[PDB]
Amino acid sequence: AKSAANKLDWAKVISSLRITGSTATQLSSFKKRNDEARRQLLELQSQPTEVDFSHYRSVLKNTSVIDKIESYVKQYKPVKIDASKQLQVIESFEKHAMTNAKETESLVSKELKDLQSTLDNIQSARPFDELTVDDLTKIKPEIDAKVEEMVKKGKWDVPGYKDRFGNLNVM
Amino acid sequence: ISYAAYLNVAAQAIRSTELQTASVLNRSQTDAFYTQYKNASEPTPITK
Amino acid sequence: ATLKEVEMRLKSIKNIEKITKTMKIVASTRLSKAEKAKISAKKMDEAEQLFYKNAETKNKELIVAITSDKGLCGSIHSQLAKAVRRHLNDQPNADIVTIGDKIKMQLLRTHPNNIKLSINGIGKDAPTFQESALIADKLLSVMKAGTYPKISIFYNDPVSSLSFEPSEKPIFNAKTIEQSPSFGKFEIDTDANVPRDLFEYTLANQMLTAMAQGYAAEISARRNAMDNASKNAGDMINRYSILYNRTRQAVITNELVDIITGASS
Amino acid sequence: RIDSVSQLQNVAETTKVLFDVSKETVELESEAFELKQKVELAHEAKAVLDSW
Amino acid sequence: YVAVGQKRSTVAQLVQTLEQHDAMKYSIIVAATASEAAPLQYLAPFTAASIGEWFRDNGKHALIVYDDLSKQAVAYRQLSLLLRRPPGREAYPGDVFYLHSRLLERAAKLSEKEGSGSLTALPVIETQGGDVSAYIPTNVISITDGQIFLEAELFYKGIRPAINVGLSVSRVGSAAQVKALKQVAGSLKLFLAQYREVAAFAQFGSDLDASTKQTLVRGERLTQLLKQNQYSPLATEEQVPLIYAGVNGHLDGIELSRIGEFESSFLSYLKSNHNELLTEIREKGELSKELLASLKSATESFVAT
């Protein structure tokens, strides 16, 4: 009932742990719980829609309100209607939400499978034995670019080389 | 490194036949903590 | 009622009287251990001092303080806190190492910026070299202690096994040792890093002495407070005893009247 | 990186449900007002009658 | 509800409260107002008893509050001394015990033969200065199957309701409470019992053993949990969680000031999510393994956060 809505909400809270930083989506959800509970407390608070026109009207002997307010209550059974044009325009907002949701969904789905392919590609091609440094130059001309820039610079020390391939020095 | 590290360790090391006295053991042991402070702001009671 | 609440309050005071008696006596016992260490320690220190006098080595600053984690030692904690406060006019911002919880709160209140190091777990232990040594080793890095051209320690000098006086003294520091007017009536190598060694040794040897002095005065204070407590409990015992006795008589009188009234009818 | 993407995948679908759910509750509160005036009027009617 | 010796205005406030809580329907108010005669005051419990016995006899269960018997005793005191009967201990002639005992023993859990109809009694003696050694208070204490000592000092201490739990006893039953609730509050008693000793150590403010101060820390939270504002009771299905949390020590950590905050919020949280859990406690009334685990998970879920 109300619990279906709220179970999906709180599931979304522990999902929202993974995507936290929507600070008024969560306030809106807290509100949706609030106002859902407000209508729930309203509808559970709900008195009868009329007087006990049988007993408690036959209680009052005097006749000036017992026909009057009975007929007035039965008159005012018209008590006006609910909005339902708000579920069209809020539904427009839901459409926008859905559009964006699907775009995001599709984007991350593509990326997920891209990452699967990428992992396999790193697995099926990536030396770990020998491999010519020329092949590394061929696959990364970044190698030669930095080298040429260093040769041009008059540098022959790469900074960090020593920090993970310590110098052999006997001095 | 430092002298008080030498003396400290020397006291720790000498208790490492085995036999020893209560005054000795106190002169060579401590079970304690220390709260440095700065601000209030303190790093927690860490073994002294 | 009245009678029972009087009697119970008188009993409370009695139980307290017993506790304060017990504590005062125990204080004498605990105090003895503090002193026992302190004599031998002071004798050891004195041999070093023989050198220091003849050497004429002389002498920011540190404030170090000594109290027990334990309470019910009297107003040693707060007389020392106060005598520290008096000397925390002499240095508003000086960096305080507080050995023991009871002074710690009070000084921490007076300035918290000042507090750089504080200890916890000493205040129940006898003064011993290991403790002093570890504190010393940590001290150079944290407080920059050797750097400071003074070090000063605050403690309670244990004049007698019935007293506590808050007292302070200055310990040698590595700058002081460096610039010392003499240390030439004894000789030692420049190829020995004697400032960094001797500072540390006398950092501990003097500090250990200060701790011993403080701890003994503190437990001595505990006896003083607990004795006055036993007395205070006696006075309240007497007041509620008199009340008890009168109240007891009144119940009898009221009952007696009831018996007479019944008999008369 | 794969782990990060996986979180986002599940989120993207499920959030649309919560949108629907939230707007639905609000609609129900509207209807409750019409009820409320029936509830109210009856209470008032009993009271006026009680005075009588 | 039997009201002896009380003024019409007080009673009028009481009936207003009861009618407000619309419990008046099943309530019967038997009264012997301050105005009403001393014989009538003496007779008022015994005729209240008769009304109760009709329910009891029918197999229907009912409850009789005798508030306050202390004023009934004064009425019998007056009555007897103006029948010129010799004053008893404290001017209540001895046989006052006989009078009270016959009245009190008509509260009975009757046989299945009698329809199981049990009139239950709650006597109320408003002890002046907690003087229980007074003849009528001594007498009543012996007769009754429980004593529910309350204490003014604890009221001032802010424990409202203010219950002197040390002397509060119920010598009878535990099928006098729910099975589930028996399981959770099993060590509520133990914690509290330890707490009493611990509190004594804590007084004089001597440096407590860490273990004693653990007890002290746990105990304090329990005390704040017990307190309840007048005219606000709590449904048992939602008293079982609060006690579970406390007894399973999850509250021991939670700070004393925000125990009250926590309590309110915890209830709201259980209403939202673990309302299934509440329904089960209502439906089955004995905590099963599944309920204990479910409840543990729920409690963890809101104790953390």
**Which class best fits the helix and strand makeup of chain D?**
mainly alpha
Shape label of chain E: globular
Our measurement of the CA-to-CA distance between the termini of chain D, rounded to an integer number of angstroms, reads: 76 Å
Q: Label the CATH architecture of the largest domain in chain E.
A: 3-Layer(aba) Sandwich
Please give the largest β-sheet of chain E: 5 strands, mixed
Sketch the major β-sheet of chain D. none
What fraction of the residues of chain E are assigned to beta strands by DSSP? 5-15%
The CATH class name of the largest domain in chain E reads: Alpha Beta
Q: Give the number of DSSP strands of chain D.
A: 0
**H/I helix tally of chain D:** 1
Helix-strand pattern of chain D = H
Radius of gyration of chain E: 23 Å
Fraction of residues in helix of chain E: 40-55%
The chain pair forming the largest interface, with residue counts per chain, is: A-D, 64 and 46 residues
Shape, principal axes of CA atoms of chain D? rod-shaped
N-to-C span of chain E? 44 Å
The CATH H-level homologous superfamily of the largest domain in chain E:
P-loop containing nucleotide triphosphate hydrolases
Radius of gyration of chain D over all CA atoms, rounded: 23 Å
The residue fraction in helices of chain D comes out at over 70%
Number of domains of chain E: 2
The SSE string of chain E, one letter per element, is EHEHEHHEEHEHEHHHHHHHH
Protein name (chain D): ATP synthase subunit 4, mitochondrial
Modified residues (Phosphoserine) (chain D): 4
Subcellular location (chain D): Mitochondrion; Mitochondrion inner membrane
Family (chain D): Belongs to the eukaryotic ATPase B chain family.
Verbal overview:
This is part of a larger assembly, with chains A (171 residues), B (48 residues), C (265 residues), D (52 residues) and E (305 residues). Chain A has helices at residues 2-16, 25-45, 55-59, 68-75, 86-124, 133-139, 142-153. Chain A is mainly α. In chain A, helix 1 (2-16) runs antiparallel to helix 2 (25-45). Helix content of chain B is 38%, strand content 12%. Chain B has helices at residues 3-14, 22-27, and strands spanning 33-36, 46-47. In chain B, strands 1-2 form a two-stranded antiparallel sheet. Chain D has 52 residues and is mostly helical. The longest helix of chain D is centred in the middle third of the chain and has 50 residues, at 2-51. Chain E is built from 14 helices and seven strands. A five-stranded mixed β-sheet of chain E has the order 2-1-3-5-4, with helices on both faces. Chains in contact: A-D, A-E, B-C, C-E. At the A-D interface, helix 1, helix 2, helix 4 and helix 5 of A face helix 1 of D. Strand 1 (33-36) of chain B pairs antiparallel with strand 3 (117-120) of chain C. The PDB classes it as hydrolase.
How would you describe this structure in keywords?
part of a larger assembly, 5 chains, A: mainly alpha, 2 domains, E: 305 residues, alpha/beta, Rossmann fold, Lysin, five-stranded mixed beta sheet, 14 helices, globular
Short summary of the structure?
Chain A has 171 residues and is mostly helical. Chain A has helices spanning 2-16, 25-45, 55-59, 68-75, 86-124, 133-139, 142-153. In chain E, the strands form two sheets. Chain E has a five-stranded mixed sheet with strand order 2-1-3-5-4, with helices on both faces. Chain E has a two-stranded antiparallel ribbon with strand order 6-7.
